[PDB]
From Swiss-Prot, chain B:
UniProt gene name: RPL21A
Protein name (record): Large ribosomal subunit protein eL21A
Location in the cell: Cytoplasm
Positions of crosslink type Glycyl lysine isopeptide (Lys-Gly) (interchain with G-Cter in ubiquitin): 31
Source organism, top-level taxon: Eukaryota
TM region positions: none
Key words of the record: Cytoplasm, Isopeptide bond, Ribonucleoprotein, Ribosomal protein, Ubl conjugation
One of the GO biological process terms: cytoplasmic translation
UniProt subunit comment: Component of the large ribosomal subunit (LSU). Mature yeast ribosomes consist of a small (40S) and a large (60S) subunit. The 40S small subunit contains 1 molecule of ribosomal RNA (18S rRNA) and 33 different proteins (encoded by 57 genes). The large 60S subunit contains 3 rRNA molecules (25S, 5.8S and 5S rRNA) and 46 different proteins (encoded by 81 genes).
Amino acid sequence: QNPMRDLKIEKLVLNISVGESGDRLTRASKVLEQLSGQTPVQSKARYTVRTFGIRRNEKIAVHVTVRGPKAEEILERGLKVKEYQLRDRNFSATGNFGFGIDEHIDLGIKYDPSIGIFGMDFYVVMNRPGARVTRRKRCKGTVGNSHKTTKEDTVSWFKQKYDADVLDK
Amino acid sequence: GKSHGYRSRTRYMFQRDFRKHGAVHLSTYLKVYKVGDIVDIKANGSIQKGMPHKFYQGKTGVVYNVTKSSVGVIINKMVGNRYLEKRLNLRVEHIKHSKCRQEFLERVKANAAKRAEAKAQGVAVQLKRQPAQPRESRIVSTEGNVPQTLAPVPYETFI
Amino acid sequence: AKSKNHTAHNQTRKAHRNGIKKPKTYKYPSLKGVDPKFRRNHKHALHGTAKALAAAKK
Amino acid sequence: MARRPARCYRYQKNKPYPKSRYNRAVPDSKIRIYDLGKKKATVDEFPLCVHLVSNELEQLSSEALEAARICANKYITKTVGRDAFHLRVRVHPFHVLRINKMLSCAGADRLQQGMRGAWGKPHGLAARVDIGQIIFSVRCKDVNKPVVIEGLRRARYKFPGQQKIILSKKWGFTNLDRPEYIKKRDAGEIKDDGAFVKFLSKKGSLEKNYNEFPEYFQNLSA
Amino acid sequence: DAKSSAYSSRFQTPFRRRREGKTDYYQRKRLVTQHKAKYNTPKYRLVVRFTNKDIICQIISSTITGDVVLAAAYSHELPRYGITHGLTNWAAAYATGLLIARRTLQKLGLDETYKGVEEVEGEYELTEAVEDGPRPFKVFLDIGLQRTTTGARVFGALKGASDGGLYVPHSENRFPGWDFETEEIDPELLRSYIFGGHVSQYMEELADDDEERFSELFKGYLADDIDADSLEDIYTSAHEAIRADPAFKPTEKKFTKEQYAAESKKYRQTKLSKEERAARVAAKIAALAGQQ
RNA sequence: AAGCGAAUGAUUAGAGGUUCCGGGGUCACCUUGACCUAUUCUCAAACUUUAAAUAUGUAAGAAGUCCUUGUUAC
RNA sequence: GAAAUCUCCAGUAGAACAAAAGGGUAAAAGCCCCCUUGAUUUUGAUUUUCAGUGUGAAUACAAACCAUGAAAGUGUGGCC
RNA sequence: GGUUGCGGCCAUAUCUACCAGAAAGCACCGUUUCCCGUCCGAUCAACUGUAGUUAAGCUGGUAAGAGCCUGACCGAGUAGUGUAGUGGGUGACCAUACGCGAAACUCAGGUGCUGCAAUCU
């Protein structure tokens, strides 16, 4: 066929939407750093609601993105939380897919006291070679309709990979 | 109270034409303006530095000064019972070459050509522009063109 | 009490009575407002041209 | 506070003054219903069309529009049935009329400053009409022409100015005359759209035209 | 998705060269504009473009009709002067900047003076005007859309032009080896970059580390069997040659343009005329409505 | 003036298309809560693509055109 | 969860630009970041209000000294 | 004639779907010691044109395609309008005379051209 058109991981984004800020976020920051090997960034709330205890610039969430083999290894190391078995949904109309989990500290690293226990959201970014064409500074362009990723294309890659299956309901 | 600000009643004068918004096409910055050139001021609303007053929109005048990014234009303004010499310091994108001037130039070159040609042969070349003279006589034949008659139409409401 | 506030009636008829005249421009218009760097040199150009002409004119 | 006579607002003396974000406290129109009768009829059911057309340039109050609407509808419905016709009010009262309210009590000169600050408050709505502009349109079958004539010649009494009833040559509310409409509808060029019809365009994507007017292309292959 | 007619009707397309993304028109305004008291003097631009596997340098002056080129140096022309591989590295970008710089100086007849730097120690030295002589030719670096960064190839071509006797305005904030703890550019480090010093040590490091990468990459160096310590010699052999004959000898240009036009013509698609378009719609209507 | 099957604001009517951000009737069940698509009627001083008539600026030369070389610290 | 954070797609601007409205703006005049103080000096010229007076505001410069940028340039307060 | 770098006019160039592309280039693409930047070499910076690919970008073709452009003795001399009348009409407004003259609509065609330089079976 064509080795270039082959579908591949682009990045995995790993966010925790927290109500508050403080030592909880310090611990939640340094659980992500030890998870992915790189520090996350604290995304800030752009609006106040008085119902979530959120102010602007409060840094009420931490998310990190990982790409490459480290992203590769972390992906299956989260899907085995639910055993490489997923939903017909969670697959976007673009191909990007994601799931959610609730623990990492004693999952794949050595536990220590004063770490906290946090839930968090996986999200997989999934595209094909030629993704600089939409991101390069000069001659920035758009991927073609034949090159666009879609739901039924990532699920097939999800079948050929991880020996996984969909729709466990 | 009544407002007579610098940009009153310019809601449309300082528009940008439909699908002509955004950056100014660069040839205006590459035009060359010499003192004495006759230019006309179509204000461009995209850039607001060195803007002409709304009176000078569509006004034509000679260029008296040429500056780093601007030109000095002399416009004549009717102030009561007489005209005044107004001197404007306008950015180069608010002005453009009047093409009325160059049309006169091309005729001037033509007249010199017609004179130099008239030197050898063809005296009385009539350099003067004649007004549109009434058409001279002619013969209108009727082949394939027998005049078809025409009568006023009856009135129908049509609606 | 109240009266007319503003009126342009007869203003144009008045303006033309003594005519509307152009400012009757001149050869060599005034060099005021033109760039000081340009004028600072135009002097020296005229100074040289006069000295050259006088040298030619003996 | 009572309504002023319509003679005071008959003529188009002012520029259009609609409800807008300048004009927030306008009263609602008295006419709310513009289509009456069997308004879901296909266009083939009602070939005849008769119009009530203004011959003057004036303003028709919303109350006049409502009152004539009631009059025409009641007469036609009683004579030929509710579903034998489709009556459409073509004109909409967007022009806001303004009123300067004068106190009519003794000693009013003390409480009211006459013409100072006389910008009238919004009073009602009117429709600006021009010469030759259609006021009402009625589509029905050729049968009930006299009945709708009387219904339309009974709505006129409720309209200021002089209006005329003219039967139209166009098929229903379409823009095209009877014979060439029949030309198209015979050649499958016409599709019903509830109260009006869609016409086949000689322009556009051939697949969409084919999907939407299959009968035309079938008749072309026969 | 399936944009409304209204949107595509009110759509103002940008300039064509912004639609394709190649030209930044916000900067080009303030590059090609001229002090209006300099009526017709061209404002020459040093356009340096870094495509994959080639470098483009060209002195460009803007006219009403468009842009005219004085002399263009590319990096597929260095092989004439000794540099064979690495036609994109920092040192090669310096080489092609020197190439265009000397090319213009010999084009405009200023080559006899404005030798730039004879010995090249890689220091920040502008071309000072020679007294009682024509001023140095002044060109402005139009990088394009390339991001400015400390120690980049696009500023390598700047330093090559500055060393070529051509007066490019610049400072050391972008030259490799710039210090943040002081206002002192590192002379040795930048001289290394002129002569492949950032490449030679990498070559040697991979030589003494492994062999697969030293073979998969750098095989061109291994194909002609040259050392990383020999990079300075071949680069100096380039620099001296460019100073000698920058006259821009073109290629042989075989298979002349008549054949070039004919060959490309036979393979490029043609736009169907009106009648055959009507034929392909009158047939299409019968095929898509043929009892379908 | 024209125009809203063009933007913004309004507006009348019918037609065709649903997510677990509610079927209100059998857990995905024929099942009325929408918006979108295509039409349709009527509009706008503080809406507009387009756009008059009238009124309006300049030019129609000897203080100009062309050829040659002279000054400048620009 | 309608609405907390993230990702992708469509997005001619339907946002933001301190505050009224109107105009202007898309590798920006918007958002985020780095560096600063030109929101400086000497006066003059000019446009608007106009008596072609003032005040106010603004425009282009010159001579300086600076800022910033890699530079072109931009900057004599706030996009107008 | 194709391509690239810089462009001019800035949709006849845009948009949507499909398809094609011989060589050359472009691009995607390959790797993190140094320059450099981010949370992430994705962007950006550096390095080799080396493993390849036209999949995509890009170029060109197709669409009774939308859009855009031009034209029409197409609407329509229509609406509107300047001037005039001791013209009409209670008026609102209308017609006439001398002039100017649309817009939507209908239809037809078209769907980038070009400048500099370099390069290409």
